Design a protein around this ligand. Structure first.
Ligand SMILES: CCNc1cc(C(=O)N[C@@H](Cc2ccccc2)[C@H](O)CN[C@@H](C)C(=O)NC2CCCCC2)cc(N(c2ccccc2)S(C)(=O)=O)c1
Length: 371
């Protein structure tokens, strides 16, 4: 009943059906591990099919406080309150939770995305206005018996499993990396390889100034230095074809005659994550089918066209949806760790498969955390 409860794509977000208020108002809500506010469109907007009508909910309580939330893409402002919330295809519970009723926004809502709100699944430390606004999942755990864990299989569609791990959603072993600090889902990258060749940087550079696991961001985003080095290595591996600079910056598409995308000219990318034991790690391996994001457009449909879904960041590494796709990712809040396994909807062709493998050991005793 919880399997296949997500819909959406990397480019516009994955969303789960929820209800808010009494009687229940159905809304589609984007699942975002990169923020901590639960918010819903609560006034008309050109891109909203529907919105939260507070006047129709007898259980709504106004908190008499405004809130402003800026993301890397988009921003909104609204009014804080609480109300009853359910998840039809999740655990069969009703919880009273904080809700931001979005009354104005800028470049937040996306035309044709099919979602009307956002579920920030990260910790109170990054909630707005401040950490006294209890996030939804904290409320869910406090008010119900639900174990303090959820998992995401992003495949479009996929699954969010609340309170547990569904073995039918992965194969092989789950490998865990520590949550370094409970704010974002902050992790530590210890090594990066492109087609098995080490980028050969001080590992702190990979985590400058943090590294996060963020289902709400489309791309793998990398600190400038790491991004520049990664692109150089990917260009070199793929040098049998030459692409415009705009492609490498994510500003223009690359297109091939339908069915002829040359996957084998593009390298695999391995991100090594800190293990749960000193100087041990494991790797997750990303295929080009993950980091070249298809852009569906009937107009270009004589071809398959893609955007390069690795991009630069000035706020640290963001392991976005294109990285999470094809892995089963367990947000094990109870044990302050994040587990990765190969997903039942993994990417592969006949030559290569995405992987989660270990253990690996390092001689260098440097702490890779930036601080
Ligand atoms: C899914 C829509 N595509 C997209 C979204 C975001 C993004 O900012 N996602 C936020 C949620 C969201 C979802 C849908 C529409 C708009 C926004 C995430 O919460 C961001 N998480 C972190 C990084 C964050 O900013 N947390 C905030 C939370 C509030 C408190 C303060 C911290 C970034 C980029 N990408 C992008 C686009 C433009 C510029 C930079 C990145 S991309 C193209 O690189 O994937 C692309």
């Amino acid at each position: 009943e919880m399997v296949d409860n997500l819909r959406g794509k990397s480019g516009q977000g994955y969303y789960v059906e929820m209800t808010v208020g009494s009687p229940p108002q159905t809304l589609n809500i984007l699942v975002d591990t990169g923020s901590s506010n639960f918010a819903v469109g609560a006034a008309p907007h050109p891109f909203l099919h529907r919105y939260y009508q507070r006047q129709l909910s007898s259980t709504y309580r106004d908190l008499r406080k405004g809130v402003y939330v800026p993301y890397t893409q988009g921003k909104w402002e609204g009014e804080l309150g609480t109300d009853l919330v359910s998840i039809p295809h999740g655990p069969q519970v009703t919880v009273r939770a904080n809700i931001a009723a979005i009354t104005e926004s800028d470049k937040f809502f996306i035309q044709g995305s099919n979602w009307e709100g956002i579920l920030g699944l990260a910790y109170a430390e990054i909630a707005r206005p401040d950490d006294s606004l209890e996030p939804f999942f904290d409320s869910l755990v406090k008010q119900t018996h639900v174990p303090n864990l959820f998992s995401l299989q992003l495949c479009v569609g996929g699954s969010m499993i609340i309170g547990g791990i569904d073995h039918s959603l992965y194969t092989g072993s789950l490998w865990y990396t520590p949550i370094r600090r409970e704010w974002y889902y902050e992790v530590i990258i210890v090594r990066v390889e492109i087609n098995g060749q080490d980028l050969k940087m001080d590992c702190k550079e990979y985590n400058y100034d943090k590294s996060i696991v963020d289902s709400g961001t489309t791309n793998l985003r990398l600190p400038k230095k790491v991004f520049e080095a990664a692109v150089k290595s990917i260009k070199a591996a793929s040098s049998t074809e030459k692409f415009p600079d705009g492609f490498w910056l994510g500003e223009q598409l690359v297109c091939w005659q339908a069915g002829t995308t040359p996957w084998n000219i593009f390298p695999v990318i391995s991100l090594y994550l800190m293990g749960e034991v000193t100087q041990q790690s494991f790797r997750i391996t990303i295929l080009p089918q993950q980091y070249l994001r298809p852009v569906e457009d009937v107009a270009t449909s004589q071809d398959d066209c893609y955007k390069f879904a690795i991009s630069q960041s000035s706020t640290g590494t963001v392991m976005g949806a294109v990285i999470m796709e094809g892995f089963y990712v367990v947000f094990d809040r109870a044990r302050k760790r994040i587990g990765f396994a190969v997903s039942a909807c993994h990417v592969h062709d006949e030559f290569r498969t995405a992987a989660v493998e270990g253990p690996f050991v390092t001689l260098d005793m440097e702490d890779c955390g930036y601080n």
